């Protein structure tokens, strides 16, 4: 029913979004979700810039043209000790997503995100969860593909 969107701080405009605490985003839902954050799927160059200033996660997610995981420090539980903006080869499942926002500043922006700003009307309880754990709840919808809403 409800949808929790757990987000990171933005690094050079790039951020991670995880839905409902598990890998649950398709490519079409990823595009809709970035759009609802006034954002786009990142390019590889945008990911590399974010990586260069400290962005890493232990999660795979969509970008433009790939599914990736950004890694600075090797960890056996996060792409088997690989580093870089690491590209997933077998990439047909559901993941998290990354998003790029053009308005964000060049370094790290942790300003609280207090709604999903480019959603539309709907009946879903949507909660933004910031990196600091603070939760902000609204009603709306952001998905435009029937196959995502009604599998």
């Amino acid at each position: 029913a409800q949808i929790d969107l757990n987000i990171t701080c933005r690094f050079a405009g790039v951020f991670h979004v995880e839905k409902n605490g598990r890998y649950s985003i398709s490519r079409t839902e990823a595009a809709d979700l970035c759009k609802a954050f006034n954002s786009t799927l990142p390019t590889m160059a945008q990911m590399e810039k974010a990586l260069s200033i400290g962005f890493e996660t232990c999660r795979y997610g969509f970008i433009e043209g790939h599914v990736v995981i950004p890694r600075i420090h090797p960890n056996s539980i996060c792409a088997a000790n690989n580093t870089g903006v690491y590209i997933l080869t077998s990439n047909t499942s559901q993941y998290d997503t990354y998003c790029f926002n053009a308005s964000a500043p060049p370094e790290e922006d942790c300003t609280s995100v207090t709604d999903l700003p480019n959603a539309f009307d709907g009946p879903i309880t949507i909660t933004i969860v910031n990196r600091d754990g603070t939760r902000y709840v609204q009603k709306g919808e952001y998905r435009t593909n029937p196959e995502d809403i009604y599998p």
């Binding site: 933005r10 006034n38 308005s103 964000a104 700003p117």
Partner: peptide
Amino acid sequence: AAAV
């Protein structure tokens, strides 16, 4: 207007 166009922020996260």
